[PDB]
Design a protein around this ligand. Structure first.
Ligand SMILES: Nc1nc2[nH]c(CCCCc3ccc(C(=O)N[C@@H](CCC(=O)O)C(=O)O)cc3)cc2c(=O)[nH]1
Ligand SMILES: NCC(=O)N[C@@H]1O[C@H](COP(=O)([O-])[O-])[C@@H](O)[C@H]1O
Length: 200
């Protein structure tokens, strides 16, 4: 299966996916990395690994639909089967999501359905949980509401900050994102016709 990874920043999840998809038994290959932001570290990681990159400045299109259309054109250019959102911090439009339904994965740094949105760690700390974690899910139109593929729990330690908690949770993210991608790329897991997760 041919994979695009979309990023907005550092790209530690991208690197974990690069590492995993290069293992001999990987059912996935990463063929393109797309960023909505210029000059971010994730682009350096892609270039270092010999993977093509494209930057699509969302600040250059009239609306969300046109921006997503620009992404989709690149996806078609590289004959992509599966899209991974790996620190990609934009909401995707309905038609784009529907087109890629069952073929687009996202990593989110909480145990969904808790702490949806862009600041999950802040929320977890404010709420006072002692267990948080991360989630890989299929992307649906409603944000962070799509079908869950894998999750991993991570403890919150007394005195944690976004810095120390995000660091601990990223260790787990780097485990479950590669595992989830392999499950989908191998056809082991798919989005079921009834909308529910199907272990084939
Ligand atoms: N349909 C759909 N789309 C999705 N996207 C993601 C991944 C992101 C999830 C969290 C999130 C939420 C909101 C925002 C935000 O307001 N972003 C600004 C740009 C901010 C900037 O560029 O500086 C924007 O969209 O314009 C950013 C991040 C998951 C997911 C999903 O499950 N369903
Ligand atoms: N709402 C989605 C969200 O918060 N995503 C989070 O952004 C970080 C990206 O780090 P990376 O660029 O090092 O992969 C990761 O922690 C990812 O789960």
């Amino acid at each position: 299966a041919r994979v695009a990874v979309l990023i907005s920043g550092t790209g530690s999840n991208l690197q974990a996916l690069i590492d995993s998809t290069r293992e001999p038994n990987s059912s996935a290959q990463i063929d393109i990395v797309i960023s909505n932001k210029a000059a971010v570290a994730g682009l350096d990681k892609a270039e270092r690994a010999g993977i093509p990159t494209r930057v699509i400045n969302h600040k250059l299109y009239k609306n969300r639909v046109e921006f997503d259309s620009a992404i989709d054109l690149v996806l078609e250019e590289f004959s992509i089967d599966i899209v991974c959102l790996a620190g990609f911090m934009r909401i995707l439009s309905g038609p784009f999501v529907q087109k890629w339904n069952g073929k687009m994965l996202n990593i989110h740094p909480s145990l969904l359905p808790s702490f949806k949105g862009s600041n999950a760690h802040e929320q977890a700390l404010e709420t006072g949980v002692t267990v948080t974690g991360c989630t890989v899910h299929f992307v649906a139109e409603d944000v962070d509401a799509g079908q869950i593929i894998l999750q991993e729990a991570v403890p919150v330690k007394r005195g944690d900050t976004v810095a120390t908690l995000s660091e601990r949770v990223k260790l787990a993210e780097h485990k479950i994102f590669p595992a989830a991608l392999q499950l989908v790329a191998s056809g082991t897991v798919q989005l079921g016709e009834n909308g529910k997760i199907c272990w084939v």
